[PDB]
Amino acid sequence: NFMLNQPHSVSESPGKTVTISCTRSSGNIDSNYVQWYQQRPGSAPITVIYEDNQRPSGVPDRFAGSIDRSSNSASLTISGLKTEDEADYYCQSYDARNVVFGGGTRLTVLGQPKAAPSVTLFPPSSEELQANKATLVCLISDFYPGAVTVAWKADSSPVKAGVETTTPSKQSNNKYAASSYLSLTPEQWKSHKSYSCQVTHEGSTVEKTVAPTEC
């Protein structure tokens, strides 16, 4: 029985090299294979190293596994650091009576560039209106950092009720996405000339407007 000790957290800027150590508490690091897993928030882990230093297909060659018997440790070295590398990393080995994991290392990539959101506003569908409901959705994607504020307008007037905005989550392009949705009656929707969603990100506001459409 042994533990694998990892740093709690490491931070580095893009294009730099970072090293994550994994020290075996008891027994020799080289008595069993060390694996490394990467996990992005809200995703399942992916293997980036097995058998100490082997990369599965799809893993970039920027990921290098090594063993240092003299410090009884394994290391994951990431060269040419990219923002997609921001994640939790877990080392793992074998006891014969167990698969044991490190406590994990949070890798922060500093100085990721600002990215203004794409904002798309969807009016209620004919189908939804037929079911006596009216929802607007303001889709907000491709933004960094992951903080927006949203204000809604009925004509020019502030909407103060029926608004929800999801907590931004990092998507596969490593920029944030969220939706703000406004629940209306069909009568409220048809009573105004338009509704607007105003998304503020890092001091800049993007406004979209939709209106009831005749045929």
Ligand X SMILES: CCN(CC)c1ccc2c(C)c(CCN3C(=O)N[C@@]4(CCN(C(=O)c5c[nH]cn5)C4)C3=O)c(=O)oc2c1
Binding of residue 100 to ligand X (CB under 6 A): yes
Binding of residue 215 to ligand X (CB under 6 A): no
Annotate each residue in 1-40 with x if it binds ligand X (CB under 6 A) or - if it does not, as one string: ------------------------------------x-x-
- Closest distance of CB 70 from a second copy, Å: 26
Q: Pick one of a second copy, ligand X, none as the site partner of residue 213 (Cβ within 5 to 8 A by kind).
A: a second copy
Give the residue carrying structure tokens 């990921």: 63
Give me the residues that bind a second copy (CB under 8 A), please.
Answer: 1, 35, 37, 41-47, 50, 54, 56-57, 88, 90, 92, 95, 97-104, 120-123, 125-128, 133, 135, 137, 139, 141, 164, 166-169, 171-172, 177-179, 181, 208, 210, 213-215
Binding of residue 50 to ligand X (CB under 6 A): yes
End-to-end CA distance of the chain: 73
List binders of ligand X among 159-188 (CB under 6 A): none
Binding of residue 46 to ligand X (CB under 6 A): yes
Binds ligand X (CB under 6 A): choice among 8, 44, 70, 111: 44
Footprint of ligand X on this chain (CB under 6 A)?
A: 37, 39, 44-47, 50, 56, 90, 97-101
